[PDB]
Design a protein around this ligand. Sequence first.
Ligand SMILES: NC(=O)C1=CN([C@@H]2O[C@H](COP(=O)(O)OP(=O)(O)OC[C@H]3O[C@@H](n4cnc5c(N)ncnc54)[C@H](OP(=O)(O)O)[C@@H]3O)[C@@H](O)[C@H]2O)C=CC1
Ligand SMILES: NC(=O)C1=CN([C@@H]2O[C@H](COP(=O)(O)OP(=O)(O)OC[C@H]3O[C@@H](n4cnc5c(N)ncnc54)[C@H](OP(=O)(O)O)[C@@H]3O)[C@@H](O)[C@H]2O)C=CC1
Ligand SMILES: [Mg+2]
Ligand SMILES: [Mg+2]
Ligand SMILES: [Mg+2]
Lengths: 517, 501
Amino acid sequence: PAVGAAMPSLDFDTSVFNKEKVSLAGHEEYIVRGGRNLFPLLPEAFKGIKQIGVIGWGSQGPAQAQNLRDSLAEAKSDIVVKIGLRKGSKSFDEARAAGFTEESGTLGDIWETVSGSDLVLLLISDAAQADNYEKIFSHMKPNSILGLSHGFLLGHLQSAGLDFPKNISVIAVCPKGMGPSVRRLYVQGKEINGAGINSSFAVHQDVDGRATDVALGWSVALGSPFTFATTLEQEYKSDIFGERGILLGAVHGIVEALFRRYTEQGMDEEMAYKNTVEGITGIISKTISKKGMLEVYNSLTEEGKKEFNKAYSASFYPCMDILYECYEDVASGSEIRSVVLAGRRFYEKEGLPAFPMGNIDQTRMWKVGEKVRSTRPENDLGPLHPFTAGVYVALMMAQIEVLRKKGHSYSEIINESVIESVDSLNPFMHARGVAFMVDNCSTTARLGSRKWAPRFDYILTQQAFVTVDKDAPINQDLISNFMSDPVHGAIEVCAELRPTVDISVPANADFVRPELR
Amino acid sequence: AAMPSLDFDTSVFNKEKVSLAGHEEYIVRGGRNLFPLLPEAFKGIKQIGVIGWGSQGPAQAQNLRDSLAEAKSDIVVKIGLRKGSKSFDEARAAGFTEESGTLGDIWETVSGSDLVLLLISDAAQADNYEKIFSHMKPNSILGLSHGFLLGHLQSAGLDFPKNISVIAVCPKGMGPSVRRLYVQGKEINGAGINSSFAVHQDVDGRATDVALGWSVALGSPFTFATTLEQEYKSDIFGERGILLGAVHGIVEALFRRYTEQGMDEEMAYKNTVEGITGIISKTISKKGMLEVYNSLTEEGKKEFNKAYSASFYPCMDILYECYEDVASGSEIRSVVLAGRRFYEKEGLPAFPMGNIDQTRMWKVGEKVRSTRPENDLGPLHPFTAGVYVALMMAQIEVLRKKGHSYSEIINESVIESVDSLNPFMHARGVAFMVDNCSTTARLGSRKWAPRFDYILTQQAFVTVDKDAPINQDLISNFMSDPVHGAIEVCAELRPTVDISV
Ligand SMILES: NC(=O)C1=CN([C@@H]2O[C@H](COP(=O)(O)OP(=O)(O)OC[C@H]3O[C@@H](n4cnc5c(N)ncnc54)[C@H](OP(=O)(O)O)[C@@H]3O)[C@@H](O)[C@H]2O)C=CC1
Ligand SMILES: NC(=O)C1=CN([C@@H]2O[C@H](COP(=O)(O)OP(=O)(O)OC[C@H]3O[C@@H](n4cnc5c(N)ncnc54)[C@H](OP(=O)(O)O)[C@@H]3O)[C@@H](O)[C@H]2O)C=CC1
Ligand SMILES: [Mg+2]
Ligand SMILES: [Mg+2]
Ligand SMILES: [Mg+2]
């Protein structure tokens, strides 16, 4: 028991920024539109703060620190952005090459930074947080603010039965895109008004009433086109699930399964990759980003529309099966535990060898991807396969329904299932294959994709593809519900808030992780 | 690190010692002629309450009823079922009735039972344990055929009540087989299904003897000693490993590779599924893993070593991950939530387990078996054998470093695969093997098989295609591993005939 879980739509109190109402399929929701002209409001937002500590130099570390180092800066404030790192760090400089040095008091030891900062940004590995939270909480300045970019720590603390220290404020600003994509559109927002990465914010513990505006100020400083409200609880349940879903894991498994099906049917290797990877990360991603899922179906031939329906009707439920399972593993705290233990396994213990993450793009189809891209003209969008579209859109709609029935706001659903996929991540796979997309994300996302991609491949091959081959009658209710689904109109409302510049991802990108350049 | 030297006190049964790779263990031999010991073994029991009529339920109850029986004991074997159970008139067909007082209500049975066996589904045990503990008599005994309930309790920071003895008798085989081989054990000596036993709580000092009695009553030829914690950790991991999960995983990966290299579909199936489940299984069963290698030709040995060296660590990666998920409480939690997803809840559809044998390779297997000679055991492919043995060795090592006894390692990683489960896949394919196991095992095989397929294709097969120089001390470890000598000893402590039906 029982059946049904409505949408919680949280209302925040801001005194600095302009709270804006948004109607998403009849649901009231509140956001704050960012901009380079909102920067003079940052001193008002960051009162009581004298130093901001950026702990870590991974993916979000480099982007958030530099974005906060600017804007501040453009607001001429006294507050200092200081980087905290472990003694003898490999990503230490790096930070000096970016600008942060010992001489100017913008770079130093981790625990010197934590102790001397009013706002602490814990931008380190999620698993590292879980194994070192006590160590960090102890150094924290009394009556200060801890900022997170993910609710992973709360999920961990709840499993252990504990909570954050009650003497400190707990906030979160979570960019709904990868680290490199945060810095990359800013940059492209220094010239044009908008451009950035959509973010959610959470206020877990408010110690003195300053929390909301600090989180909002931090989000605007990053360049977030729109900042929507959520909780740490809702964030980690949707984000950890999201990366394992359509964002990385599911699209990978779907792509592997469809490629294998087409090659078994006689289609040559090179066209098979184009009909799967290039199509999804080409026209499909672009058509959804600007017109939505319904327009993907409409552009197809009458022969194609039937093919789309055959795929959707057969793929929707098998996709839901795994997504349903995955979410519940995250919500119960099983998956957070799994990530923590996997992080420990990266090193030798208990007489067993160390197991770092391996390469996921050395197999058959990704070498075909090398050959395809080597003679591919620039600005290529790929072919639109009707059957491929059906599967991918079914996967998208399955993810939406799961989160919908699990009581998430539409902004969270649309960002986690539609926006981040088609805007942020997919171009990276179009640029250089699956690994360039997955391994540029967080270690939690990377471990997540590797674990759950195989589950979608298997479910598609065992169930969805078998349904198509049995030539079972098309589910008329599924197709009818897809066409009339409230999300399609809700995505149109969201697409208005989208930064009106496409993300430019070159092959030899310098803004990516300093080991994939 | 760590090794479990496990001992127990038995006043009525005869305990015998075994050395496995330098480690001492204690075993209890069974047999029809030990039944006159049951009256004393169940000293203070007047009624055994078998709760549940699915797989293990029917078999164990009949195996108890017949057996004491031969002991001429007053002990009543009563079947307890839910109010709206569909198994009532099925149990009456087996001779369990209200008139004899051998069939009743689930909760009426528990309250009037001195020994109550919880042979209901694992998902049921997790969501109904409170009502069970309240119905227990103070100083009565709760018997388990799996440690799922403990792992569920432990992961919630809870445990069984103080005033109740907790024991476990776990047969290394499925329900239908436990009865099938018991009735054959009346004809031919040594026939049956081996078991492992555990004693979690013992409030008076009767529990150790009662468990052994229960084990020999089921017709267990050999009973091994374990802990309840080690039982579920090894069992839940085992079925996701070489028993069902990994063997399906690697079989899918190898078939795909062979067919992609231009090999005939039916030949590929023979080189993968038929070989592993037939001849490789038979060779390990009779003479161990070293015989697989030594039976190969000189160029075949070079192909075996290539496969082993490339597959060992990638296989360990998933096994190592899987085990820690089981120990941490994550995997048991996953099974419980999966069980709940069989019915509609939270505005979402119901998601029962689908078919796993309707894909390309298993349809190919049907054409292979349709024209397959009776007596056929398949070809011994050196590369396929390289992968399978690497997988076997990797699972042995993971369990070894995590502190399991050799008898538990060997039964879980070697014997039950080659003697008991593989023949099912040889007989009718993957679904016949997997879906005849317990629900928690079926969910296990479905969740982890894809993990073994991917890592083997992503890492193991890429290594071979690179022509990486063989990791020689990995091969040297397989050749010199003391476990092979332990398997030789364990193979003598085995049921007398086949379970291969
Ligand atoms: N990556 C992304 O694109 C996104 C990340 N996030 C979230 O933002 C947060 C930041 O993670 P991300 O940017 O991915 O960084 P990573 O997860 O890649 O972690 C790498 C950084 O963590 C540091 N670190 C690792 N172990 C420890 C330790 N034991 N003690 C102290 N520091 C340690 C490393 O320091 P060193 O330099 O010394 O090795 C390194 O700088 C995460 O919680 C993630 O969930 C949210 C959205 C996107
Ligand atoms: N199956 C196997 O091969 C092996 C199983 N085991 C272990 O033995 C134990 C028994 O498993 P198994 O024999 O598979 O049993 P099953 O999984 O087949 O369980 C089915 C039985 O449980 C009853 N049941 C289901 N839900 C409830 C409930 N909520 N309350 C009370 N009864 C319920 C059903 O009653 P109804 O008649 O109303 O449907 C049915 O009789 C498990 O812990 C398992 O791990 C150990 C070795 C092998
Ligand atoms: Mg994310
Ligand atoms: Mg994340
Ligand atoms: Mg077993």
